[PDB]
């Protein structure tokens, strides 16, 4: 009653893999890009949520959260300087792959290579 999930949308499929990222904050509703495992909901992935750094402002980094499934809490960490996070498009990427695991004290951050790494955030 005082939280409920988010409905499924039919106008998205599930993902290949269950290590797919999906959902996004757009206006502030639960947004659904790709339906994990047999179509669950990506507001119980709200514990699994991440950083994703697309840019930085004046006014410091801007962090974006997105919602992964699949827990990736057993894989593998990734390296400072490494593939770390395959995304379709470094603006709005509906399509989110979970490489490695990245932990909650670092942010995914687009370099020039053309792809996320997985570093810790660093103060401007």
Same mark, same amino acid.
Request: hydrophobic share 15%; no cysteine.
């Given at each position: 009653k005082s939280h409920t999930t988010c409905p499924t949308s039919t106008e998205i499929d599930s993902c290949s893999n269950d290590n797919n990222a999906c959902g996004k904050d757009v206006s502030g509703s639960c947004s659904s890009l790709c339906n994990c495992g047999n179509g669950q909901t990506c507001f119980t992935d709200s514990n699994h949520t991440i950083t994703l750094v697309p840019y930085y402002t004046e006014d410091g980094p801007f962090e974006k959260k997105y919602y992964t499934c699949g827990? =990736?809490?057993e894989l593998d960490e990734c390296y400072?300087? *490494?593939?770390?996070l395959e995304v !379709?498009?470094? *603006? *709005? =990427? !509906?399509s989110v792959e979970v490489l490695c695991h990245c932990p909650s004290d670092k942010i995914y951050l687009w370099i020039h290579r053309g792809y996320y790494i997985c570093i810790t955030p660093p103060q401007p």
């Open positions: 827990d =990736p809490s400072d300087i *490494d593939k770390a !379709n498009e470094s *603006d *709005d =990427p !509906n």
